[PDB]
Ligand binder design. Structure first.
Ligand code: BTI
Ligand code: BTI
Lengths: 489, 131, 489
């Protein structure tokens, strides 16, 4: 019996129920509500009632841990929401708020249902309010499998992570017809809101998958990292890997020349456990890396610069990416580990015309507000305000480390030499820049002041990180009483 | 051992050693007799559903290569209008105190005009043109 | 005796002490620390010690209410910060955190002090952490009277409001010398970070003043609105104006044609008390108005659309502006009053390439998260998701009102008629669009559903607003327990 799904598969596409079956465990899905009708009675809609009413909501179970989910249905009315569709979603989110369980939704709606009038707006508003209230209480993940247009786009935005499917998905606020009507330009749906556009240009989508099957397979892996609720502790899984594994290849990663580049992944991979990195937003703002990883069987958060791309310089997009990652990680009590290599901020008129001052402050706010244990490692250099922003010791950092060839200075040697000698005799470059770099572009001064705990061999990083992260397991820090902060938007 | 390379397997007397490269949870990168393969391990539902999945073909473009970011060209490696092979460095831009090195991803030859040394122009120009 | 200030005034500029004297009451300033030296002992700095060390910090008193302030000094070392300058500021902010008092700072620093090494970075980090921790506890206002460059720019950014002086002030992260060095373009300091640039292009500065004297005079007026701390109640001042003043001119403000424009200030001004509006960011994103005002002697927050500019259409910049205003107003228990007139969102490729999805969600998050009393008035129209975003009744709104000629529909009549009849006989425009607009583009349906409390004459708005704002004085609402939210950055 394979009835009524032949029409769907013929278009090389899967069904909502099949997606739900693929996500959860083999036999642990219990559909909650299945016999519900729209009761519209307008515009010749009194007929063609549907039992499911276009939504599939259940409970399920992943890796032995509970979950909640819902999936849109494209065959029935195009997946449009109504006064009645939104009730099921509201009930699921409320139940997942009472119990410490997350929510995952597979969006496929074609837009609002016009035949209901303003009831669709009512349902949208209720879903928006539930998302707003419960953000930071239970993790929310959203996946977009098909078209997603109109005002329905906003609820995925408030969710913590949004993923996209490559061939047959798109998302935008207004359709290309209106764009043609007002501006006069003919742009296709994919050219407007395709997965690539949101992966590279707008920065909304947190990832892209080639197929639905791969999407489910990796969504399970992502779910294996998250904590169940706000009050539950960070999960710890058994692992045969051990902190005594030898990592001596880190002694040679940093080149002896100051103008040559290297890949920061060569430093990230040895420290964490084998094959346990899940990069977030891999194709957007490549000069910074963010993602999840495990250290001795417990999930941690990774944020590191990359001198491979644009000399590892902070920017607007990198600031937004890092700020969102830090805020989410702190909201759910996940340790943060950072690797620092920054020469400063990206210079340019477009930057000031785009508001670098606002955006660069977001990362600093996220780092200063955080109360989870932090570990910082300075590999090569840290200059100016970039050193302050990237989790400096003064921002209530727990432990800070440096490598023997690091440099921590106010600015580059040339600018310091220029400002320290206004009209000093010519040729001052040769006998002053070298001396200043020798005397003050080294971690000795910063260690004398007390800004780094110790200068360590690069081969001891795994040992030190495991020791510190084990000791810091029970830190309790609290901020002054506030209704909420006022972050620079 | 989980997430490790060596895998010792012994059926009866026969003994074999294979290697485990990596995976994306549907495809396994395993080495057999010093050769890489990608075995697919999927259940009944995944097998019956993988037929109904689009398989797009990636762009096969043999054309000019552009510099991703502005900078300065200080060193060049390849010659104008000769053979080029995959993985060969082509030139090196230096920007904000940093020498990168864009190479040739994959191709057989080129037809183009070289950007001369010290040409601080970049801005996503056509440094090398592949034809 | 007018010694040592002749050199300053000759350049048509005022001194820090003169600014402090102008701000506070005539004789209520008590300078806190005045004999402090830098104790540097490097690069020939062992000499030329200064008593004040370039900073003036005190307590003062404005309108009989306490304050705290500090002012940079440009004559002494260019106003550079040090390990010692930042200590005074930290002490002032800590004291103003213990006591419920705000802080106001007049920035004039030329950058960091190179002769101290990394101690300047240490001081910057401490100030950044204090700003981050105490934001949302005590209001912070910052004014920029002169140059402000380097990494010192970030602390004004975290503060709630930043104002600028016209002729002789600028702010940016990196100087034009580096821009010339890397990109090769010659841009002056004013062309890069002048007050106009931040007033119109970047949206960082919240206002601009022509002179320092006017700056102080209006800063006092702004201070008269704010509450003293997080736990203190909203100030109420005596006022001879009364809720029984006749406003019948509102019956004629809205034109009888749907395509003609009008000025929303003609609706804003009658409702509030006379000469009591303080616009915030007047020259940026003119399609939305935000500011402070008084209603029956108590300060409230005003957020209204304007059909004069771009048909009152929501956008990226308007969303950011409104979101920041709502967040600040809610953080300190200030009532919010909104006027709604929106046809939707601005359509265009640049918008999606710039991330409309992220930015438009910020206003919705700010409106949904808020717990202060809200009053909403729909004058003419509200369509699509814009109706949901602008404080709809479903987002825990207290009271909502509409005017007799309003319209609340899913979308415009043309699109609805197109979607409701695919290939219906030609000429369907004339006998369908008119009928649909007549039947469903009216507040009767939304009133039937229960989305507006009542349909009122435009002459009763002041009476209704005063009644509701008086009754709602003691509302107590609380959100679920969270360490903090996760707003879409
Ligand atoms: O020496 C002239 C150009 C130096 C730029 C150094 C890098 S580029 C972006 C960032 N901003 C700075 O001021 N320094 C770094
Ligand atoms: O009828 C064709 C153009 C109608 C646009 C109506 C305004 S323009 C911006 C906003 N977006 C919409 O869909 N409607 C409004």
């Amino acid at each position: 019996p394979t009835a009524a799904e032949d029409l769907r598969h013929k278009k090389k596409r899967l069904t909502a129920m099949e997606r739900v079956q693929l996500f959860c465990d083999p036999g642990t899905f219990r559909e909650r509500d299945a016999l519900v009708e729209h009761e519209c009675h307008n515009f010749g809609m009194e007929k063609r009632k549907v039992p499911g009413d276009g939504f599939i909501t259940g409970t399920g179970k992943v890796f032995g841990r509970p979950v909640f989910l819902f999936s849109h249905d494209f065959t029935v009315f195009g997946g449009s929401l109504s006064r009645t569709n939104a009730a099921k979603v509201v009930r699921i989110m409320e139940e997942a708020a009472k119990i410490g369980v997350p929510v995952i939704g597979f969006n496929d709606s074609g837009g609002a249902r016009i035949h209901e009038g303003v009831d669709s707006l009512a349902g949208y508003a209720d879903i928006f309010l539930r998302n707003t209230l419960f953000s930071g209480v239970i993790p929310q993940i959203s996946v977009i499998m098909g078209p997603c247009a109109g005002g329905a786009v906003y609820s995925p935005a408030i969710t913590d992570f949004t993923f996209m499917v490559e061939t047959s998905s798109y998302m935008f606020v207004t359709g290309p017809e209106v764009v043609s009507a007002v501006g006069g330009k003919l742009v296709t749906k994919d050219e407007l809101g395709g997965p690539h556009v949101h992966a590279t240009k707008s920065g909304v989508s947190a990832g892209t998958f080639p197929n639905d099957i791969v999407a489910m397979a990796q969504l399970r892996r992502l779910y294996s990292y998250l904590p169940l609720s706000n009050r539950d502790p960070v999960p710890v899984l058994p692992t045969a890997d051990e902190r005594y594994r030898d990592v001596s290849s880190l002694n040679t990663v940093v080149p002896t020349e100051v103008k040559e580049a290297y890949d920061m992944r060569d430093v990230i991979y040895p420290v964490i456990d084998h094959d346990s990195f899940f990069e977030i937003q891999p194709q957007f703002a490549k000069n910074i890396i963010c993602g999840f990883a495990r250290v001795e069987g417990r999930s941690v958060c990774i944020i590191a610069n990359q001198p491979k791309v644009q000399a590892g310089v902070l920017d607007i997009d990198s600031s937004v990416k890092g700020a969102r990652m830090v805020r989410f990680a702190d909201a759910f009590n996940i340790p943060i580990i950072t690797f620092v290599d920054v020469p400063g901020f990206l210079p340019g008129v477009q930057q000031e015309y785009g508001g670098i001052i606002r955006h660069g402050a977001k990362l600093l706010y996220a780092y200063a507000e955080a109360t989870v244990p932090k570990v910082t490692i300075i590999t090569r250099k840290a200059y100016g305000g970039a050193y302050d922003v990237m989790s400096s010791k003064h921002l209530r950092g727990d432990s800070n480390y440096a490598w023997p060839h690091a440099e921590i200075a106010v600015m580059g040697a040339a600018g310091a030499c220029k400002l320290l000698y206004s009209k000093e005799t010519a040729e001052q470059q040769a006998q002053r820049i070298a001396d200043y770099e020798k005397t003050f572009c080294t971690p000795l001064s910063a260690a004398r002041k007390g800004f780094v705990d110790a200068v360590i061999d690069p081969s001891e990083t795994r040992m030190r990180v495991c020791e510190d992260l084990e000791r810091l397991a029970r830190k309790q820090l609290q901020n002054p009483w506030k209704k909420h902060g006022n972050i620079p938007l | 051992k989980a997430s490790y390379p060596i895998i010792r397997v012994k059926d009866g007397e026969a003994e074999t050693v294979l290697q485990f490269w990596g995976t994306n949870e549907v495809t396994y990168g395993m080495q057999m007799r010093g050769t890489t393969f990608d075995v697919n391990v999927m259940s009944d539902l995944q097998s019956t559903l993988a037929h109904f999945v689009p398989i797009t073909e990636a762009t096969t473009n043999t054309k000019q290569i552009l510099s991703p970011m502005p900078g300065v060209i200080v060193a060049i490696k390849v010659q104008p209008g000769q053979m080029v092979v995959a993985g060969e460095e082509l030139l090196t831009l230096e920007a904000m105190k940093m020498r990168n090195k864009i190479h040739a991803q994959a191709d057989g030859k080129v037809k183009e005009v070289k950007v001369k040394l010290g040409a601080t122009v970049e801005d996503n120009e056509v440094l090398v043109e592949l034809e």
